[PDB]
Amino acid sequence: QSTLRRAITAAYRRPETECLPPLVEAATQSKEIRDAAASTARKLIEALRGKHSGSGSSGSMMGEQFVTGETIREALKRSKELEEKGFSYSYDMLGEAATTAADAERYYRDYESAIHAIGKASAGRGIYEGPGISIKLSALHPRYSRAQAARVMGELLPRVKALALLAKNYDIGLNIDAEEADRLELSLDLLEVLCLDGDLSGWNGMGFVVQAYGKRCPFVLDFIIDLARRSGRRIMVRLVKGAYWDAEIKRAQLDGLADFPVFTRKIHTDVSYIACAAKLLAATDVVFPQFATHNAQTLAAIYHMAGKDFHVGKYEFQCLHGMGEPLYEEVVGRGKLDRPCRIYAPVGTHETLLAYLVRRLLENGANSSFVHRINDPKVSIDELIADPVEVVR
Amino acid sequence: SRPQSTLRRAITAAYRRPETECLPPLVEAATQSKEIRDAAASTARKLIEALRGKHSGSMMGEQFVTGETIREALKRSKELEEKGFSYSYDMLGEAATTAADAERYYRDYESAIHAIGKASAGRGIYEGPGISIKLSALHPRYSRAQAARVMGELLPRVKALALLAKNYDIGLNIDAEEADRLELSLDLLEVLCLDGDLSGWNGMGFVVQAYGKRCPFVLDFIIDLARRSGRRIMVRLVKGAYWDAEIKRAQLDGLADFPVFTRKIHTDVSYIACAAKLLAATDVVFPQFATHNAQTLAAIYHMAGKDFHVGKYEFQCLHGMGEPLYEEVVGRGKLDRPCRIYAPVGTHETLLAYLVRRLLENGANSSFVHRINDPKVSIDELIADPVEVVR
Ligand SMILES: Cc1cc2nc3c(=O)[nH]c(=O)nc-3n(C[C@H](O)[C@H](O)[C@H](O)COP(=O)(O)OP(=O)(O)OC[C@H]3O[C@@H](n4cnc5c(N)ncnc54)[C@H](O)[C@@H]3O)c2cc1C
Ligand SMILES: Cc1cc2nc3c(=O)[nH]c(=O)nc-3n(C[C@H](O)[C@H](O)[C@H](O)COP(=O)(O)OP(=O)(O)OC[C@H]3O[C@@H](n4cnc5c(N)ncnc54)[C@H](O)[C@@H]3O)c2cc1C
Ligand SMILES: C=CCSCC(=O)O
Ligand SMILES: C=CCSCC(=O)O
Secondary structure (H helix, E strand, C coil): CCHHHHHHHHHCCCCHHHHHHHHHHHHCCCHHHHHHHHHHHHHHHHHHCCCCCCHHHCCCCCCHHHCCECCHHHHHHCCHHHHCCCEEEEEEECCCCCCCHHHHHHHHHHHHHHHHHHHHHHCCCHHHHCCEEEECHHHHCCCCCCCCHHHHHHHHHHHHHHHHHHHHHHCCCEEECCCCHHHHHHHHHHHHHHHCCHHHCCCCCEEEEEECCECCHHHHHHHHHHHHHHHCCCEEEEEECCCCHHHHHHHHHHCCCCCCCECCCHHHHHHHHHHHHHHHHCCCCCEEEEEECCCHHHHHHHHHHCCCCCCCCCCEEEEECCCCHHHHCCCCCCCCCCCCEEEEEEECCHHHHHHHHHHHHHHHHCCCCHHHHCCCCCCCHHHHCCCHHHHCC | CCCCHHHHHHHHHHCCCCHHHHHHHHHHHHCCCHHHHHHHHHHHHHHHHHHHHCCCCCCCCHHHCCECCHHHHHHCCHHHHHHCCEEEEEECCCCCCCHHHHHHHHHHHHHHHHHHHHHHCCCHHHHCCEEEECHHHCCCCCCCCCHHHHHHHHHHHHHHHHHHHHHHCCCEEECCCCHHHHHHHHHHHHHHHCCHHHCCCCCEEEEEECCECCHHHHHHHHHHHHHHHCCCEEEEEECCCCHHHHHHHHHHCCCCCCCECCCHHHHHHHHHHHHHHHHCCCCCEEEEEECCCHHHHHHHHHHCCCCCCCCCCEEEEECCCCHHHHCCCCCCCCCCCCEEEEEEECCHHHCHHHHHHHHHHHHCCCCHHHHCCCCCCCHHHHHCCCHHHHC
16 A cells, blocks of 8 residues: 555545546657647558558458467467568457466466467567567456455465466566456555566566556556566556556446446547656656557557667557558658557467457447547548547546 | 336336346246257257358448349349348437438438338238437437437327338337337337227337346336237337446446446346246247347247247347348248348448447447357357356
């Protein structure tokens, strides 16, 4: 318990109207930055609309567009082409929400075998230039959402620590994906224990996702930035909007709550994301920000907010396999923006793919999504480059 | 005793009966003769080889919607109607969260019935188009409010819609939704079938989900209701669209035994057993066999025997999924059996929930429509009778 932890708990269901003013202020950019971001965003979107990206490119319900390979060996082999273009990878062994001990055990073995393969393929490239892995805590505990948080974390900790130690041995990144809002606190407690565990000293590969659609986002970030500074671990922080919005709304509508744990207007999430990006960019000494987005306006805003100084390891962008390549082909490389992007790369069979595909459908099919609007003949470029702070009303 | 005590008790007793206890009667009821199984395998093999042959061997789901408005969807239906297909239109929208949303869905259904009835032009309930409705669209708290309150506000609304459908002589089908609303929807069906204001019209329809343990006992109740009401009830037999959600709900409810089967081939056996029940009651119900599975279709086609006329039974499929299969079914040179296309009408504001269920259907490794495109799955496996796996 701390003042920083108290701010997280206090924001859980803070009224949406009260959350917004501080985010609006922090997300407000100077005129020069806004003008430069508009120019960059226009250039990117014109390039995108000469392509055929977005929801129209999502492929068939077989989900072939979204999976990098069936096995880690297959996915690693297929990664060489984009790696020399300036992309990196974070591999996701598909599988989540284990319901039996056998399933949780299988997912653990999958993650463990992937770390060995990824770590050997990394070949000493380290946590920024080389590949990493992403895990879901719900894969590793058979009653992750339906058991007491204290006991869940206590059985989960040895498994996650063992995986982190393997990642340290090979010096690769290991990211904890963010899932449902009611599990933020548990996963954050796990992150704290790991960052204070002396067995993991000298390794900066521990990573953690924070969801900007959540009202707690800036306060989670303050806690993580402070944890990094005091632990000496340069935590990799993946800033995302969030993948479970429809489910969070449905659960909140059934819990009879007046105030949800997530925002309810998409523009509020966009303001939240930019405000939280400003917080992360002011903390690159102690954290490694990873800006996961397919929205060219969001990207261009962050690109200019970061300033002129850049080196590999300062920050990166990220995208999902099968969704982000058209945009980021206009970003990576010395002929573009010369900023790196890490591809989140699902690995598994068609069975383990289904739950992930449903979230990709809700993301690609929503009229509010950038990837849908980029292909919408009714949506102008002027609208696509609008600054969320200047639009909110 | 209470009216229909024996039939109603059998439904309640099956609700969460252990899966192993549900299956043996269904397996025996779904067992067909070797001669029928050989003929069905030949038919299924032909259907599958045609499926690929005419189709060279989309997640955003524009192919799942027939039109943005009922006028648009009706215009786009002429081509397939001329071939021998019929339609059931679905105004997209469900799970109304406010009384105003429910009123808006009601008005969409009312206007659609006028338009569909005009287009029907007296073709009747079998050859002409119909409508499908979801009760969750018509009550603002459908999954949550007590059945007494839901019934008292829902019944006048559904009765008014049924009266318009009667006035145009079109079909009106109540779609089946989550398992916890089966009982309410069935009580509503009974009151409507016994309502004299709807006399003379056989267009009332009702879905039963074969993935549910109550399915054969619900069918018993419906067939008996048809006999005592004098209505020939249209009965759409489906497997079911909410399986993933039912499993998650039952886990969250703490249940030791779920209201649905957990082995996919058990749902297939249930479907075939229930088809045998419906095919023996065509005097009092109109069976509508909704499936995209060529093996299920072939089994029912041969189970039904050589005697057929339009109005005896039909098949059904979803727009954007079933047309390739049923183009090998409708028509004198094919199987000479009719098919009604379930045709969603709406926009993105109402497409999400339906599209998610389509993705869970199309993307599941256990689904026929996925297995037909899976290089690991032989034609032998696609045509195999699942009843022989558990017999
Ligand atoms: C590499 C990568 C990793 C990711 N990891 C995770 C993870 O671990 N956990 C996680 O939850 N998400 C994660 N995501 C985010 C998620 O999968 C989506 O890709 C992301 O939210 C889409 O944002 P965008 O900026 O690309 O698009 P945009 O179109 O700009 O934003 C869409 C997002 O806005 C939000 N939204 C939509 N409607 C509303 C509304 N009415 N009110 C409020 N918010 C709304 C949702 O978050 C939606 O995804 C990750 C994304 C990437 C690219
Ligand atoms: C015209 C039409 C109308 C329909 N109306 C409705 C309706 O009102 N309500 C409704 O709920 N459904 C309805 N459905 C059914 C649903 O939408 C699917 O289309 C149907 O269940 C798929 O069955 P299939 O025989 O085509 O495919 P198959 O691949 O043979 O069967 C797949 C089905 O098996 C079941 N299943 C999958 N995995 C398991 C498992 N592990 N254990 C048990 N069962 C499993 C599910 O029902 C799944 O849909 C309708 C279908 C059609 C064609
Ligand atoms: C794509 C994001 C990574 S975590 C949530 C999901 O898997 O959708
Ligand atoms: C497609 C079937 C009719 S009812 C369940 C759904 O809408 O998916």
